[PDB]
C-alpha cells in the first residue's frame, strides 16, 4: 500500500490517513489501532530498534532508546514517507509483476512474499510469541552477507567453487558474525552462544562508576528500574542519576 | 415494552390512586393533569443565530426572514450558470466547425508532407483555421466568463492535431454534424431562457423543485435506503 500510495509524488501523509488508505486498497479486515501501531513501529529508527533498514522515513516524534520506542506521538501528529530509493533498489518494480498474489474477496491485494535482492530475514531483529512457537532473531553483519552472495554469484571470485561444494555438502567456509553496528559494547563467543557486554568506567577517588554503554536492545529506564528492585544491590549504592 | 422505532411505556399505579392525582397536579387549559403528571409536553423555543457569507454572526427573528434572505442567491446563481453556458456553447460551435472542414480537406492538405508542429501550425494558419485553446474549451473547470473569453483565442492548433485516424471516417462526420446541430439548438434555447419573467432561469428552477420533491418522496418511502 505504500508503494501504491506514494507513486505520483512522495508527499507526506499522516499515520491515520495512510492507515485508512492501506485498509481500503489492500483489503485489511481488522481494527485500526493495531494497524496504526504497526505503521508507527515500521517507521521507527533509533539505536536498538527492530528494523535496521526501515521501509519508511519517519517525520515527527518517533520515540527514543530510553523508553524502548514506546514514547512516540499519537497518529494524528506524526508522518511517514516512502524511502523511495531503498525500496526501489531492494524490491525492484519489474520483479513484482511476476509473483504469486493473495486474493481477498476476488481482487488482488498483495504478494505471497517479496523476494529481495538481499536475504532480509536475517538482517534485522525480532522477538515475538505465537501459537506453539517462538520467534527471536539477532541481525548479522552486512559485510558477511555481501561476501557470501558475491561468492555465490560472481564466477571471478576466488571462493566460488569452494562455496558451491559447501552448499552441496552442508558445511561452512565464510564467517557470519552478529551485527555490531551502532553498538559500542563488545561481543564474545563462549561455547555455543554469543554474549553482549556493556561498558563501565570506575573511579575509587569518588566512589563513582559511570555506565557508558548498555547491552543490545536494553531500554534505559527499564534497566534503571530493574537495578533498584534488587535489595542485594541497593545495600551498596546510595544515589543513581541519569 | 417499546420497539426500536415506536414508544410503548407502561406504568403501574398504587391501588386507588387515580383520584389523588387530580387535586395534586392541577389541570390548566394548556395541559392536562396526566400530562402535568407524566412530563408530556414541551415548548419549541428557537434561537435563530447563524453565520453569514464573509463570516460573522447574523441573527434573525423569524423563519420568513431566513427564506427571504436565501432566495436572491439562488436567483443570481441561475443567471450565472446560464450566461456561462451561453459563452461555452458559442465557443464549442466555433471549435467543432473547423474539425469538420479539416476532415473534409485533409486529403487536399497532405499533413504527412510537413516536418514538425511549427511548419504544420504555419500551414494551418494560412488556410483560415482559427487558433483555439483546446483545454479551456473541453474542460472549463472554474473559469469565469472574462477568463473564458480572454484566454480562449490565444492558443494553438492542438485541437486539430490530436485527432485520431479513427474519426476521419464518414459515420464520424455524420456524428459530429448532428452534435453541432444539437449544440446550436441548445444555444438558441439558452438565449431564449435568458429573457423570461420574472427573472432569467425561472422554469429550470421549477423543474428542479419537482425533481427534488420526487427524490424526497422516494427516499421517505424506502426508509431512506433508496432501494
Amino acid at each position: 500500500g505504500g508503494v501504491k500510495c506514494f507513486a505520483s509524488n512522495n508527499r507526506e501523509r499522516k499515520v491515520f490517513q495512510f492507515g485508512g488508505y492501506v485498509a481500503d486498497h489492500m483489503f485489511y479486515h481488522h481494527g485500526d489501532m493495531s494497524l496504526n501501531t504497526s505503521i508507527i513501529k515500521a517507521a521507527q529508527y533509533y539505536p536498538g530498534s527492530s528494523h535496521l533498514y526501515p521501509v519508511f522515513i519517519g517525520i515527527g516524534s518517533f520515540g527514543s532508546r530510553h523508553l524502548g520506542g514506546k514514547d512516540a506521538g499519537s497518529p494524528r501528529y506524526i508522518s511517514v514517507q516512502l524511502a523511495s530509493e531503498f525500496i526501489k533498489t531492494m524490491f525492484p518494480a519489474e520483479d513484482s509483476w511476476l509473483l504469486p498474489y493473495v486474493f481477498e474477496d476476488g481482487q488482488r491485494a498483495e504478494p505471497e512474499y517479496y523476494v529481495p535482492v538481499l536475504p532480509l530475514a536475517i538482517m534485522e531483529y525480532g522477538a515475538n510469541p505465537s501459537e506453539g512457537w517462538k520467534y527471536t532473531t539477532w541481525a548479522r553483519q552486512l559485510e558477511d552477507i555481501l561476501a557470501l552472495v558475491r561468492a555465490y554469484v560472481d564466477k571471478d571470485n576466488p571462493k566460488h567453487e569452494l562455496l558451491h561444494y559447501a552448499i552441496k555438502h552442508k558445511i561452512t567456509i565464510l564467517p557470519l558474525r552478529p551485527s555490531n553496528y551502532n553498538f559500542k559494547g563488545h561481543l564474545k563467543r563462549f561455547g555455543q552462544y554469543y554474549y553482549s557486554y556493556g561498558t563501565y568506567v570506575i573511579s575509587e577517588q569518588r566512589n563513582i562508576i559511570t555506565i557508558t554503554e548498555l547491552p543490545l536492545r536494553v531500554p534505559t529506564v527499564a534497566y534503571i528500574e530493574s537495578i533498584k528492585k534488587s535489595s542485594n544491590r541497593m545495600t551498596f549504592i546510595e544515589e543513581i542519576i541519569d | 415494552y417499546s420497539s426500536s422505532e415506536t414508544i410503548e411505556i407502561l406504568v403501574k399505579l398504587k391501588p386507588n390512586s387515580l383520584n389523588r392525582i387530580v387535586e395534586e397536579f392541577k389541570e390548566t387549559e394548556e395541559q392536562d393533569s396526566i400530562e402535568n403528571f407524566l412530563r408530556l409536553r414541551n415548548c419549541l423555543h428557537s434561537h435563530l443565530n447563524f453565520v453569514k457569507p464573509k463570516g460573522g454572526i447574523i441573527e434573525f427573528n423569524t423563519y420568513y426572514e431566513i427564506l427571504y434572505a436565501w432566495l436572491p442567491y439562488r436567483r443570481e446563481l441561475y443567471q450565472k450558470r446560464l450566461m456561462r453556458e451561453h459563452a461555452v456553447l458559442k465557443l464549442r460551435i466555433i471549435m467543432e466547425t473547423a474539425i469538420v472542414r479539416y476532415i473534409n480537406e485533409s486529403a487536399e492538405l497532405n499533413l504527412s508532407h510537413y516536418e514538425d508542429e511549427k511548419e504544420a501550425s504555419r500551414i494551418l494558419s494560412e488556410h483560415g483555421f482559427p487558433p483555439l485553446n483546446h483545454t479551456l474549451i473541453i474542460s472549463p473547470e472554474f473559469a469565469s466568463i472574462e477568463e473564458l473569453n480572454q484566454k480562449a483565442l490565444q492558443g494553438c492548433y492542438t485541437y486539430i492535431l490530436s485527432l485520431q485516424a479513427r474519426e476521419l471516417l464518414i459515420a464520424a462526420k455524420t456524428r459530429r454534424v448532428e452534435k453541432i446541430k444539437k449544440m446550436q439548438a441548445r444555444l438558441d434555447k439558452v438565449e431564449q431562457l435568458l429573457q423570461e419573467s420574472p427573472f432569467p432561469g425561472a422554469s429550470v428552477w421549477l423543474e428542479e423543485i419537482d425533481a427534488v420533491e420526487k427524490a424526497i418522496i422516494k427516499g421517505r418511502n424506502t426508509q431512506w435506503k433508496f432501494h
Partner: protein, 80 residues
C-alpha cells in the same frame, strides 16, 4: 453442564454474495470455502461480495431475516 446441554451458540454468515437480479444471497461461513468458491468462477463482474467483520455490521433487512429464523440457527454442544 456441557454433558446436559447448557452451552449454546448462534451461527451467523461471514460472507454474503449478492447476485444481480436474484433475490437470495449465497452465504459462506468460512473464508477458505469462499476462496475455493471464488477461484472456480470465470466472471465475477456483477457480484457484490460483503465481508461481515463483526456482527454489528449487519444491515436492517439482514438482521430481520436473521431474527425470523432465530431458533433455526442455535446449536448446542455435546461432550465426548
Amino acid at each position: 453442564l456441557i454433558i446436559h446441554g447448557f452451552v449454546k451458540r448462534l451461527l451467523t454468515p461471514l460472507i454474503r454474495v449478492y447476485e444481480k437480479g436474484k433475490t437470495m444471497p449465497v452465504e459462506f461461513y468460512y473464508e477458505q470455502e469462499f476462496d475455493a468458491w471464488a477461484k472456480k468462477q470465470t466472471s465475477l463482474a456483477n457480484h457484490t461480495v460483503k465481508y461481515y467483520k463483526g456482527l454489528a455490521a449487519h444491515d436492517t433487512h439482514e438482521v430481520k431475516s436473521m431474527f425470523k429464523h432465530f431458533d433455526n440457527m442455535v446449536y448446542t454442544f455435546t461432550l465426548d
